Design a protein around this nucleic acid. Structure first.
Lengths: 113, 51, 48
RNA sequence: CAAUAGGAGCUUAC
């Protein structure tokens, strides 16, 4: 009677953006990203990918409430680098790693026959 | 579950017989803004079922 | 007033008066019976 | 635009 729908986890409304960027003014060259309709699956992947770059000084995420399907991420970078470009770089790197993983799994599965 | 990292502590784990008791929140949740009053005292009536 | 002793409805067509109303009716019956003794024979064991 | 009362019984959390 107060239970929301189980499909609001993934169905993006038309008035709700997928992604929203605001800057953290306290420290230089830092941004706060809120990902709507996502959870730990994307958050942990991105966080541990970004944490290994030399030019990334701060990266973290949290899910403020388990009953709401979003997370917020704080990311800081050095002076020359922009956190957004590093975010695209991390996304592309994980995509390439997954493509290589898929190719090797398919070849291995064929060889196993 | 969130990170796949091992937990530093080990967890007591196994099956246990649990029971579903008759007390459900949906049988208890009640709110009232305005509603029926008593004839004699003209004060809010008594009862979740009576609002 | 009847506000202090309102009637009520039991099954959509029936009503019983409050206790105070029946008590007042009993008092009225008693009063009229008193007014039926000082008007005729009353051998002192009915007036009391 | 209007959904009785009184009782008894069994329960909930302290």
């Amino acid at each position: 009677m107060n239970a929301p729908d189980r499909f609001e986890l993934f169905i993006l409304p038309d008035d709700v953006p997928k992604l929203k960027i605001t800057p953290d003014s306290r420290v230089p060259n830092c941004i706060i990203i809120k990902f709507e309709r996502e959870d730990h699956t994307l958050a942990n992947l991105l966080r541990e990918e970004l944490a290994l770059y030399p030019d990334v000084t701060f990266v973290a995420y949290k899910v403020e409430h388990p009953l709401f399907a979003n997370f917020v991420m704080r990311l800081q970078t050095e002076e020359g680098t922009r956190p957004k470009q590093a975010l695209e770089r991390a996304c592309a790197s994980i995509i390439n790693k997954l493509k290589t993983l898929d190719h090797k799994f398919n070849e291995e599965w064929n060889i196993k026959n | 579950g969130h990170t796949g990292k091992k937990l530093m502590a080990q967890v007591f784990f196994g099956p246990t017989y649990y029971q579903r008791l008759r007390h459900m929140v949906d049988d208890k949740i009640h709110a009232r803004a305005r509603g029926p009053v008593q004839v004699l005292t003209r004060q809010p009536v008594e009862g979740r079922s009576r609002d | 007033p009847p506000q202090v002793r309102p009637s009520i409805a039991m099954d959509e067509t029936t009503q019983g008066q409050d206790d105070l109303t029946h008590k007042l009716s009993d008092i009225l019956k008693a009063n009229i019976n008193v007014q039926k003794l000082e008007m005729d024979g009353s051998p002192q064991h009915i007036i009391n």
